[PDB]
Motif scaffolding. Structure first.
Motif, PDB file in Angstrom:
ATOM      1  N   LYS A 167       0.520  -1.133  -0.070  1.00  0.00           N
ATOM      2  CA  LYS A 167       0.147  -0.083   0.030  1.00  0.00           C
ATOM      3  C   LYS A 167       0.826   1.298   0.012  1.00  0.00           C
ATOM      4  CE  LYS A 167      -2.282   0.525   4.034  1.00  0.00           C
ATOM      5  NZ  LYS A 167      -3.819  -0.227   4.603  1.00  0.00           N
ATOM      6  N   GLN A 212       1.860  -5.985   3.016  1.00  0.00           N
ATOM      7  CA  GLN A 212       1.802  -6.353   4.384  1.00  0.00           C
ATOM      8  C   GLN A 212       0.916  -8.091   3.939  1.00  0.00           C
ATOM      9  OE1 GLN A 212      -1.396  -2.895   4.434  1.00  0.00           O
ATOM     10  NE2 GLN A 212      -1.759  -3.766   7.093  1.00  0.00           N
ATOM     11  N   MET A 262      -3.956 -11.077   0.968  1.00  0.00           N
ATOM     12  CA  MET A 262      -5.297 -11.459   0.918  1.00  0.00           C
ATOM     13  C   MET A 262      -6.004 -11.983  -0.558  1.00  0.00           C
ATOM     14  SD  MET A 262      -4.778 -12.711   3.966  1.00  0.00           S
ATOM     15  CE  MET A 262      -6.355 -12.802   4.808  1.00  0.00           C
ATOM     16  N   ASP A 310      -7.106  -2.231   8.256  1.00  0.00           N
ATOM     17  CA  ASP A 310      -8.068  -0.860   7.788  1.00  0.00           C
ATOM     18  C   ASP A 310      -8.223   0.014   9.264  1.00  0.00           C
ATOM     19  OD1 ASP A 310      -8.208   1.520   7.474  1.00  0.00           O
ATOM     20  OD2 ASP A 310      -9.917   1.542   5.397  1.00  0.00           O
TER      21      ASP A 310
HETATM   22  O1  LIG Z   1      -5.593  -1.811   4.130  1.00  0.00           O
HETATM   23  C1  LIG Z   1      -5.502  -2.576   2.992  1.00  0.00           C
HETATM   24  N1  LIG Z   1      -7.135  -1.790   2.518  1.00  0.00           N
HETATM   25  C2  LIG Z   1      -7.987  -1.041   3.050  1.00  0.00           C
HETATM   26  C3  LIG Z   1      -8.763  -1.560   3.177  1.00  0.00           C
HETATM   27  O2  LIG Z   1     -10.498  -0.002   3.425  1.00  0.00           O
HETATM   28  C4  LIG Z   1      -7.370   0.278   2.047  1.00  0.00           C
HETATM   29  C5  LIG Z   1      -6.623   1.234   2.850  1.00  0.00           C
HETATM   30  C6  LIG Z   1      -6.534   2.016   1.473  1.00  0.00           C
HETATM   31  C7  LIG Z   1      -6.073   2.784   0.445  1.00  0.00           C
HETATM   32  F1  LIG Z   1      -5.518   3.366  -0.514  1.00  0.00           F
HETATM   33  C8  LIG Z   1      -6.742   1.145  -0.036  1.00  0.00           C
HETATM   34 CL1  LIG Z   1      -7.535   0.662  -2.005  1.00  0.00          CL
HETATM   35  C9  LIG Z   1      -7.344  -0.270   0.912  1.00  0.00           C
HETATM   36  N2  LIG Z   1      -5.576  -3.592   2.626  1.00  0.00           N
HETATM   37  C10 LIG Z   1      -4.023  -4.131   3.177  1.00  0.00           C
HETATM   38  C11 LIG Z   1      -4.162  -5.417   2.827  1.00  0.00           C
HETATM   39  C12 LIG Z   1      -4.347  -6.018   1.499  1.00  0.00           C
HETATM   40  C13 LIG Z   1      -4.182  -7.552   1.738  1.00  0.00           C
HETATM   41  N3  LIG Z   1      -4.716  -8.414   0.625  1.00  0.00           N
HETATM   42  C14 LIG Z   1      -5.758  -7.489  -0.058  1.00  0.00           C
HETATM   43  N4  LIG Z   1      -5.839  -7.975  -1.126  1.00  0.00           N
HETATM   44  C15 LIG Z   1      -7.096  -7.704  -1.944  1.00  0.00           C
HETATM   45  C16 LIG Z   1      -7.299  -8.712  -3.334  1.00  0.00           C
HETATM   46  C17 LIG Z   1      -8.597  -8.730  -3.982  1.00  0.00           C
HETATM   47  O3  LIG Z   1      -9.667  -8.103  -2.905  1.00  0.00           O
HETATM   48  C18 LIG Z   1      -9.351  -7.264  -2.019  1.00  0.00           C
HETATM   49  C19 LIG Z   1      -8.482  -7.692  -0.967  1.00  0.00           C
HETATM   50  N5  LIG Z   1      -6.102  -6.658   0.825  1.00  0.00           N
HETATM   51  C20 LIG Z   1      -5.444  -5.477   1.287  1.00  0.00           C
HETATM   52  C21 LIG Z   1      -5.896  -4.088   1.444  1.00  0.00           C
END
Ligand SMILES: O=C(N[C@H](CO)c1ccc(F)c(Cl)c1)N1CCc2cnc(NC3CCOCC3)nc2C1
Length: 328
Positions: A42, A93, A96, A155
């Motif tokens: 991120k 991180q 997932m 988050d």
């Molecule tokens: O912290 C977040 N997400 C938060 C949600 O509010 C977030 C914060 C700022 C942003 F700018 C965005 Cl965009 C998203 N993460 C980290 C860890 C992780 C690990 N794996 C997957 N995989 C995805 C595969 C596709 O399906 C959904 C999960 N996503 C994530 C998102």
């Protein structure tokens, strides 16, 4: 380069693929050449706004201190060697596969999967609440899932130390009418109801509409419920609303397990003082096939001023917090 934006993470992290973006950040998946697995990275750029700097510092400080199977961790943090050059912070991180929002838009969840997801949400919530922390923004898109049905809460941007926005569909009724750990239990109740029928239980269209959806199902509050609304204008507003009878849970959810509806009823209690607590929810008969309190750990130390610090000081705190991940 990722969609016109610089993602300077290499040489350890390669083969980048866009996942999504937010108000001040972009998520990509990448290949970690040291651990031999794809990770989530991120890129966050919060340093021009006070609120974003608070969200960034909270997420970093909290997630670096927490260690639990049902909570996303931080593996690595990449930023510039000097404060003046630091414009973005990259948070690495565990990757997932999906989130509960996506899963509920596409799949019918079996009673066993609903039970198991609810168990893991509460197991992680036990840990968070034992650290004296409130997540404050639990919703399906903040619940990450892998191929094997393992769940991780993510988050922690809005998380705060207990002292007792894209959607308000998961916000407890006292947030409008007036907060405790009880606000997170309400959000979990909303998520359980959503897992049962693949639809949000209280999808309010505007601010006051949110409470109308709540009362439209729970029914008008009792005299004891009303007596606990201390605010004069909020009590007069509640008294002014048309009378509503409680909708029985089995009418809304005719196919659900009666034990899941009993737990749902206790989580979605109007009065936060009467709402079920995380340890009581884990011990509920609905969760009996997974409940194992010797395998439900608590935080080693309760977690411990930010809401008034300027963005320039919060950047210094972010720089200090990330220093141990920098090269020698
Ligand atoms: O912290 C977040 N997400 C938060 C949600 O509010 C977030 C914060 C700022 C942003 F700018 C965005 Cl965009 C998203 N993460 C980290 C860890 C992780 C690990 N794996 C997957 N995989 C995805 C595969 C596709 O399906 C959904 C999960 N996503 C994530 C998102």
């Amino acid at each position: 380069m990722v969609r016109g934006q610089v993602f300077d993470v290499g040489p350890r992290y390669t083969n980048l693929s866009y996942i999504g973006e937010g108000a001040y950040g972009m998520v990509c998946s990448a290949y970690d050449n040291v651990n031999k697995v794809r990770v989530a990275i991120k890129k966050i750029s919060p340093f021009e706004h006070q609120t974003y700097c608070q969200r960034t510092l909270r997420e970093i400080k909290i997630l670096l201190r927490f260690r639990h199977e049902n909570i996303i961790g931080i593996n690595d943090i990449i930023r510039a060697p000097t404060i003046e050059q630091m414009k973005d912070v990259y948070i690495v991180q565990d990757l997932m596969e999906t989130d509960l929002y996506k899963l509920l838009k596409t799949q019918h969840l079996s009673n066993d999967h609903i039970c198991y997801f609810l168990y893991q949400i509460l197991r992680g919530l036990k840990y968070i609440h034992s650290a004296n922390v409130l997540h404050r923004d639990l919703k399906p898109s903040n619940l990450l899932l892998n191929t094997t049905c393992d769940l991780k809460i993510c988050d922690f941007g809005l998380a705060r130390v207990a002292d007792p926005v894209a959607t308000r569909w998961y916000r407890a009724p006292e947030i409008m009418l007036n907060y405790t750990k009880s606000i997170d239990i309400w959000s979990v109740g909303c998520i359980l109801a959503e897992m049962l029928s693949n639809r949000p239980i209280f999808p309010g269209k505007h601010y006051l509409d949110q409470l109308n959806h709540i009362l439209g199902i729970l029914g008008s509050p009792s005299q004891e419920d009303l007596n606990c609304i201390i605010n004069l204008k909020a009590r007069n507003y509640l008294l002014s609303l048309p009378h509503k009878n409680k909708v029985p849970w089995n009418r809304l959810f005719p196919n659900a397990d009666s034990k899941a509806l009993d737990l749902l009823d206790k989580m979605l209690t109007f009065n936060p003082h009467k709402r079920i607590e995380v340890e009581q929810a884990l011990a509920h008969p609905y969760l009996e096939q997974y409940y194992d309190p010797s395998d439900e750990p608590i935080a080693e130390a309760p977690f411990k001023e930010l809401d008034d610090l300027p963005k320039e000081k919060l950047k210094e705190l972010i720089f200090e917090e990330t220093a141990r991940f920098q090269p020698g």
